[PDB]
Design a protein around this ligand. Structure first.
Ligand code: NAD
Ligand code: NAD
Ligand code: NAD
Ligand code: NAD
Ligand code: CL
Ligand code: CL
Lengths: 259, 259, 259, 259
């Protein structure tokens, strides 16, 4: 769809599941060269690699923990070694777990801040360093959430991580705009990824979540991958420092509907 | 680029010049059917019509003042009569003029509010009425500005109009999301349209404006038309109630750059 | 409470009822001189006058329609003629009525925009004109709503009016900050004014509204008057261009509570 | 000024210098009981204690590093042991240092996130735990910055910390609103604290900073302490989850002044 994406090198964290996988596959359809970062020793990244290739792209897989500086550096080095360059960095890895805030252990707080915010900082830092050193008008996409604006009781760590990611993104966007490097967030609402399959298998929880979505349906991963492909492309040439919410209207305050 | 736009009917206000013209031409490239609303016969809407057709689309022209309810209704009726339906409504007409706020005449305030905000309300209202009556999962795009968030001394009317347009858009998006009707704003920064050509011909004013744009350049109309085409397409299927800023980073507070 | 408010001249629109009346009385407690604007001779402005005086202030009453330029000018002139100066202008008059947006008559749109937004523009304009001409470090407070950020299906006019008021306020604040004139909004949530007494008399509607308020109660007018007194005082000396929300948490997205 | 603050117990982090010291002294003027947390005895916390007492309050001092969980717990325990209860928690400790973002060391990122965001989380968590366990309608104030909204090149860690603090605050406010616990941020612009004395001693840097402030002057610490006293008081009874900016108009985009 986006001719300028053909042959571009895109690295994606958390790419063996969910939104990261859908983005990898979509970038394959755009004939990009994808670096599939995976963490967990339970995910089948090679299957994603095969789907990327089948869709029309190239792909390499690389294990790495985004909370480890050396692993993030190695993601970027994998792009350089396999494909010659890096054009697009997508920091997508993330996690959450519910705890009443006054009972929230510091270990849980640290893990969520570390993965969701610090991990995106490290990936952004390493990609931008490469872009600046090589005069590449590169692109960074940080996967945020409606919860960079919507508070989230029981998930104070997650909300803080994404609120932080917003200002991290905006700062990097301002700082590197003169070099033609764009940095943007995507803010998904509720999306039907495999991590959510348990929750949405319970018809009551599925219905409750749907009741908070004005458009009335839980989104599909492809609807988020569409946003990433567009933002990375030259169609979005004048767009930097934004959060593009793709949420079926969640951020519009669903409690205030007429009906 | 967006196969689903082929044969879609899009009506655009203020389409004989500047961003509206660029959007008409881009929708032509997408093989859409364009209703070109124009304000004055001196504007040469037929030239825009021919460029839409040359780009690969179909087009008709219709004169109309968006401050007149009957004229707005007639824009929508023109789509129905000439092409059989309406799929996308783009409320783009606008104007501005500088006056110190404490000296701003009510006539100037009324003209800007009436054209920029009330005009978009009427167009949105008439399009959505049609969509609801005919079960069309239609789309409304309202042309806003960075000045829905960035204050604008000497242009208090314009800032108010776009701040108002933001909440109008979000309200309509929330209200009609359950019917699959999406409503979004575009927020351009400084764009090199013909209306601005005088200002930017003065190298001092051009340099001053460029100094407020982190990306360092004034955008081209095609960079805004790109946003409209995407938002109107099914690529943006899960996106409603947003403002998509395309501003080279203006909303990131250019005074706070490091250098 | 605020010693610097003693003897200050404050004009308040919509001061014969609800929040405007509460503000008049609070400014009386602060020993200010209050111009009580009222709309209709069916209202009892003299009762408000007596309560202001009993609370410790001075007060005069003046009829005026904020949709009439001459009446707004006369409100300001009343302050000057009766008390010698104007220090604080509070644009508080407002109204709303529910209609589905696709059915909203232009007459209803115009009345709400005219009263809520244009009326506040005129009052702000006339107050600031006086401040600038007489080197007064004056203060403007515009009564907004949570609905300058929260969309409001059935009330698209009201939401637009307050979204517009936000950018109007911020523009005036930026424009006149160098002269030491501060301009701010207050954003109330649900407040127990007599205009709402119908709705809240129905225990079901009272409970429904309370379910959207995290703090669990509908606010009292005095809780808004407290905000006005503070913003007008020198305690808020470094505060300009803000919206101070007093909403029991409504803007925090009540649909996302844990319980 | 605020009678309800008399005898309230307020704990303040970073209270041996700058804004924290000014807040301690202001709460003294309100006849509160102040727990002055300090970081190093190279600061002179006993001098602050004496100033609090001289202003009209009571005070104790307690050393503590807000990056150490047990030190934060001990601040709250100090309030309980010395004064019998805790009513107000003010998380004010913070730091910043400039580094180009692509060169920002993880150690610097971690120290700023840890102090500025995690430290405020721990203080908020411990105070709210105490409030919930003892049915106290307590109050938390988190010291943020204009940089929870204004991006800050060279200070990506600081901006992320305050953007995160915003969503942390809003989450806690939503979560604990039903128990009558309020949680709010203050967002100072440039304030003449001793840490800034060197910078503002350079007339060029002072003038440059002033040029970014619409009101045209750098604020004094007392102007921030005024905001804290108000927010903590029952005057702000219906105010929760907000950020109250006190910035002389910085967040209004100073580059867009009329000129
Ligand atoms: N699905 C949704 O509804 C939704 C909504 C809003 C935001 N998000 C965000 O989208 C992103 C993807 O979420 P998802 O729904 O696909 O769920 P997911 O859990 O499938 O995706 C997260 C991925 O990150 C990986 N990961 C976790 N810790 C890691 C680490 N330290 N290093 C490297 N990889 C690590 C996980 O193994 C997983 O593959 C996350 O940032 C999440 O916060 C998702
Ligand atoms: N160009 C920019 O830098 C810029 C930046 C931000 C926002 N905008 C917005 O984009 C839109 C297009 O602006 P542009 O730059 O192309 O300038 P423009 O002045 O060429 O376009 C405005 C168009 O609206 C038409 N119009 C005005 N009043 C009308 C009325 N009452 N009825 C019908 N048509 C009417 C004009 O004739 C003109 O064709 C406007 O809403 C403007 O506020 C432009
Ligand atoms: N009560 C709430 O819950 C609430 C919430 C958010 C915002 N507000 C805002 O607070 C303000 C006051 O509302 P209220 O709740 O006290 O209700 P209200 O109806 O008692 O007060 C509005 C006042 O404005 C006056 N008014 C109306 N049209 C006028 C005109 N053209 N010229 C002059 N005066 C006119 C009315 O006569 C009335 O005295 C309004 O701007 C309203 O939008 C109220
Ligand atoms: N002064 C300004 O212009 C300004 C502007 C916006 C925000 N702020 C914020 O206001 C707060 C106060 O800053 P200030 O201007 O008073 O400067 P400051 O440096 O004098 O105050 C910070 C205080 O926090 C203490 N502190 C630092 N790390 C700590 C730790 N780990 N544990 C405990 N205490 C620790 C310091 O010792 C100091 O007393 C900070 O959070 C700062 O980010 C200040
Ligand atoms: Cl909600
Ligand atoms: Cl700026």
């Amino acid at each position: 769809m986006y001719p300028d994406l053909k042959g571009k090198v895109v690295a994606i964290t958390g790419a063996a599941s969910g939104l990261g996988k859908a983005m990898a596959i979509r970038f394959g359809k755009e004939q990009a060269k994808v670096v599939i970062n995976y963490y967990s020793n339970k995910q089948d990244p090679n299957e994603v690699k095969e789907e990327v290739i089948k869709a029309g792209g190239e792909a390499v897989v690389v294990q790495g923990d985004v909370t480890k500086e050396e692993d993030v550096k190695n993601i970027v080095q994998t792009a350089i070694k396999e494909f010659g360059t890096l054009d697009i960095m997508i920091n997508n890895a993330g996690l959450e777990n519910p705890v009443p805030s006054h009972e929230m252990p510091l270990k849980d707080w640290d893990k969520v801040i570390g993965t969701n915010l610090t991990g995106a900082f490290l990936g952004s830092r390493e990609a931008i360093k490469y872009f600046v050193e090589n005069d590449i008008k590169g692109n960074v996409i940080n996967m945020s959430s409606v919860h960079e604006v919507i508070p989230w009781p029981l998930f104070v760590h997650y909300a803080a991580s994404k609120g932080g990611m917003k200002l991290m993104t905006k700062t990097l966007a301002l700082e590197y705009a003169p070099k033609g490097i764009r940095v943007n967030n995507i803010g998904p609402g509720a999306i039907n990824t495999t991590i959510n399959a348990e929750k949405f298998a319970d018809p009551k929880q599925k219905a409750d979540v749907e009741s908070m979505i004005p458009m009335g349906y839980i989104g599909e991963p492809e609807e988020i991958a569409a946003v990433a492909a567009w933002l990375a492309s030259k169609e979005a040439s004048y767009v930097t420092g934004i959060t593009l919410f793709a949420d079926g209207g969640m951020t519009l305050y669903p409690s205030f509907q007429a009906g």
